Design a protein around this ligand. Structure first.
Ligand SMILES: [Cl-]
Ligand SMILES: [Cl-]
Ligand SMILES: [Mg+2]
Ligand SMILES: [Mg+2]
Ligand SMILES: [Mg+2]
Ligand SMILES: [Mg+2]
Ligand SMILES: [Mg+2]
Ligand SMILES: [Mg+2]
Ligand SMILES: [Mg+2]
Ligand SMILES: [Mg+2]
Ligand SMILES: [Mg+2]
Ligand SMILES: [Mg+2]
Ligand SMILES: [Mg+2]
Ligand SMILES: [Mg+2]
Ligand SMILES: [Mg+2]
Ligand SMILES: [Mg+2]
Ligand SMILES: [Mg+2]
Lengths: 50, 120, 119, 153, 203
RNA sequence: GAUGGGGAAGCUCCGUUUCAAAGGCCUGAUUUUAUGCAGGCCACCAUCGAAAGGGAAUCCGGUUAAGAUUCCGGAACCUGG
RNA sequence: UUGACCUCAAAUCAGGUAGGAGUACCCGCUGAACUUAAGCAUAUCAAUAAGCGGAGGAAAAGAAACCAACCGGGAUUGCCUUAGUAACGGCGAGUGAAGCGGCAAAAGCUCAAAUUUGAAAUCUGGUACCUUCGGUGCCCGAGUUGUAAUUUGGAGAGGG
């Protein structure tokens, strides 16, 4: 997997940037109902099936 | 009589081929330069590790467009900053961006160019 | 802040290209300052000005091409009307109104008359 | 190539097999000397050209429209009659003095009955060689039939 | 003119003259491709009465079609059902071979419209047809009042929907008591006769 | 696994040099201009298929919190022009 | 030798066109079984589901090679009715239209087959210009192996 195609690495980059908690100022908006990041992914729990 | 044919194989004869002379243009407005100097060089990288190379190795670190190759990066650096480039090394970072290590020739100092740009 | 489209339209293409280069230099300079300051909202104004200048340049270049093809039966496809694919394949008004000489004579001789049941 | 080979084998196949008399009569064509004499007479009655028709109309317009003529300021034309439908009608009305028949018509049914029609109507006919040659005297690429109805004294 | 003689002579197919012509022509067709362009109609009289005109925009194509029944395409003949449906060999295709010829020519020239077709020749293996095609993009057709109806989008792929003369024959589109099942479409008639109609005030 | 072809109502199937008019680099000819025009050459006739098969060419020393036969210093080699 | 014709090719030749999607409704092809018959094979489910090809704002059908047997009606489509009827069916289970009558909506038509023959009178394209969903002039080409005008059965045509 060290020798990887560009398609695999590009999707790996996208998953890396999405692995963050919810920004705090989102909860302070008017009529906000989002409490947490429901799509959080961790490498030890669910695989990407890429 | 008849033409003398020394070969029993018949082949397609060669006929005149004309070049295109369109009645109207395909797009009528050429697109501008898709990768100019300001698009090849996006912004300098100013992490602590990158700053050491500027002071020590005479190397400037830049974030560049994913579509730019080493020829375009060298040409852009010379035109934007009026310097000379010895060689360029590039890599694709884990976040999907391209980083270029640009080493200047001995006639130029990477430190005084870096603060001329504004970053330190 | 920002450029005005109506002001740009009163300028030639030589000085429109120069302004585009000047804005590109300014945008690059602001990117360096963004790496040291906590926030820098001025970056958005320069980007929109670059978009506005490119729009005005494109309008002038396309308009000059329209004058070059004025009256000619063939024009570039990007300068033709869009409509839909089906509408562009339909018969024109002239073609859809064609009749034979046999039918034209009948129409002139016996048209739909106007009448009323009064007396 | 395939189109060349199919072209030569069809010629062979049409003579290897027996040919019925209705089709076999077209193997006899007018000889060189008589055909040359025939075309000399037919060349004297060429149809008017498009350019020549231009002069007649502009002369006729300047003659009858302003001169109050009876549309008869021009002499009666003499020309070779052509057209398969036109010529067949002329033969059925006993108006053709001589009919030329081409032996090269690939859809042969178009012309296969003409010798019998001419024979029954009493119109002399000749099977001449070359449909392209007949077209030359009617300003066409191909004519496949030609006829004379009225000839100068 | 000569068209009248052509019509009557074509009906004597077993005369000595026509037997000779049909033998030499059936060989010539077999040496060409299954579908190929024809420079001119081989039966100009027959083409005219089907709507053909000798002007730019009219195209003639020739096509051969295999004869015989339609074998059921099942592996090894097994049908996996009741014995009433176990037939394999004596089954007949509901469309004619003439219809099949038009369909394959239609796909070959998808920029054209199929007008009509007619029989020309046959042997033990193939039946031969010539298909009449009209170009809906040519200005000679779009400006022609008698033929610009074909340019309407409702007439695209007439042979695919059985709107040609051979298509309407196989659909049973005729008048009279003999065509009660297929007067105005077999499936539409079946829907009408199998529909329960209820009104607001029940009858 | 395309094409040329032949099957199949059809989605598609067969077949891989096949019943095909299947193509281009050595120049000469030209100083209107770019390559039209003369000999001859060659008929091989798509493409995909290996990070363990075949295959042009790099080594030592040093350096980072985390990279290196890729960076630094020194010393070589191959291909194209 | 040269110039035509016919047929067949080539070009990143000039200008166009086809594919895919959607698919409730529409036009065709192909095509079951569960089920019912208190078993079951014909039958039934059903000329249905699934599969495949092709359209539109509607589609299809349509101006009789019709219905009738009457004092006759008069293109097509839909509604009410005819009618669970005539008829079909191991005449078992089951299946099953049509003419008339009332109504909604109403609309008619054109090619082939004839010599313009004292005049291919017809048409694509190119080009210049203009009043540009087109028009005029000019020039090639298509076409007599038939393009216009004229006539479609209710008629109609050539003469007086
Ligand atoms: Cl990795
Ligand atoms: Cl017709
Ligand atoms: Mg690298
Ligand atoms: Mg295959
Ligand atoms: Mg490979
Ligand atoms: Mg390591
Ligand atoms: Mg082209
Ligand atoms: Mg049972
Ligand atoms: Mg039971
Ligand atoms: Mg059972
Ligand atoms: Mg279905
Ligand atoms: Mg639509
Ligand atoms: Mg409606
Ligand atoms: Mg319709
Ligand atoms: Mg009628
Ligand atoms: Mg009725
Ligand atoms: Mg039933």
């Amino acid at each position: 997997a060290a020798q990887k195609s560009f398609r695999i690495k590009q999707k790996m980059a996208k998953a890396k940037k999405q692995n963050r908690p919810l920004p705090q100022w989102i909860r302070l908006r008017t009529n906000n109902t989002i409490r947490y990041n429901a799509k959080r992914r961790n490498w030890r729990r669910t695989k990407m099936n890429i | 009589a008849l033409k003398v044919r020394t070969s029993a194989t018949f082949r397609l004869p060669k006929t005149l081929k004309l070049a295109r002379a369109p009645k109207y243009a395909s797009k009528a407005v050429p697109h501008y330069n898709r990768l100019d100097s300001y698009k090849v060089i996006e912004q300098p990288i100013t992490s602590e590790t990158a700053m050491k190379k500027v002071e020590d190795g005479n190397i400037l670190v830049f974030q560049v467009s994913m579509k730019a190759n080493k020829y375009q990066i060298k040409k852009a650096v010379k035109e934007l900053y009026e310097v000379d480039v010895l060689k360029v090394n590039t890599l694709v970072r884990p976040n999907g961006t391209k980083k270029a290590y640009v080493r200047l020739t001995a006639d130029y100092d990477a430190l005084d160019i870096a603060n001329r740009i504004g970053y330190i | 802040a920002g450029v005005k489209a109506y002001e740009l339209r009163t300028k030639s293409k030589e000085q429109l290209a120069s302004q585009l280069v000047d804005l590109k230099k300014e945008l690059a300079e602001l990117k360096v300052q963004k790496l040291s300051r906590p926030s820098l909202p001025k970056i958005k104004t320069v980007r929109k000005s670059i978009a506005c200048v490119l729009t005005v340049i494109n309008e002038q270049q396309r308009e000059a091409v329209r004058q070059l093809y004025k009256g000619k039966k063939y024009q570039p496809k990007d300068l033709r009307a869009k409509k839909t694919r089906a509408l562009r394949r339909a018969l024109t008004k002239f073609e859809a109104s064609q009749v034979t000489e046999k039918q034209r004579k009948k129409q002139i001789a016996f048209p739909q008359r106007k009448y009323a049941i009064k007396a | 190539p395939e189109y060349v080979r199919v072209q030569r084998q069809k010629k062979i196949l049409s003579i290897r097999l027996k040919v019925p008399p209705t089709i076999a009569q077209f193997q006899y064509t007018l000889d060189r000397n008589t055909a040359a004499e025939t075309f000399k007479l037919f060349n004297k009655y060429r149809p008017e050209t498009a350019a020549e028709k231009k002069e007649r109309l502009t002369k006729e317009a300047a003659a009858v429209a302003e001169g109050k003529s009876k549309q008869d300021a021009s002499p009666k034309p003499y020309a070779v009659k052509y057209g398969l439908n036109h010529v067949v009608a002329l033969i059925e009305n006993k108006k053709a003095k001589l009919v030329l028949i081409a032996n090269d018509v690939d859809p042969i049914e178009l012309v296969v009955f003409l010798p019998a029609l001419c024979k029954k109507m009493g119109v002399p006919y000749a099977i001449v060689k070359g449909k392209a040659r007949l077209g030359t005297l009617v300003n066409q690429k191909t004519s496949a039939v030609a006829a004379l109805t009225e000839v100068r004294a | 003119g000569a068209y009248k003689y052509l019509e009557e002579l074509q009906r004597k197919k077993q005369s000595d003259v026509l037997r000779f012509l049909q033998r030499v022509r059936v060989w010539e067709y077999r040496q060409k491709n299954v579908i190929h362009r024809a420079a001119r109609p081989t039966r100009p009289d027959k083409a005219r009465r089907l709507g053909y005109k000798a002007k730019q925009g009219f195209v003639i194509y020739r096509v051969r079609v295999r004869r015989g029944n339609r074998k059921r395409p099942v592996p090894k003949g097994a049908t996996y059902g009741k014995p009433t449906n176990q037939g394999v060999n004596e089954l007949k295709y509901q469309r004619s071979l003439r219809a099949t010829a038009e369909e394959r020519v239609g796909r070959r020239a998808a920029n054209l419209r199929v007008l009509n077709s007619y029989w020309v020749n046959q042997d033990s293996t193939y039946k031969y047809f010539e298909v009449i095609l009209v170009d809906p993009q040519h200005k000679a057709i779009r400006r022609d009042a008698r033929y610009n109806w074909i340019c309407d989008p409702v007439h695209k792929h007439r042979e695919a929907r059985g709107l040609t003369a051979t298509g309407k024959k196989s659909r049973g589109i005729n008048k009279g008591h003999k065509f009660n099942n297929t007067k105005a479409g077999r499936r539409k008639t079946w829907k009408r006769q199998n529909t329960l109609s209820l009104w607001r005030y029940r009858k």
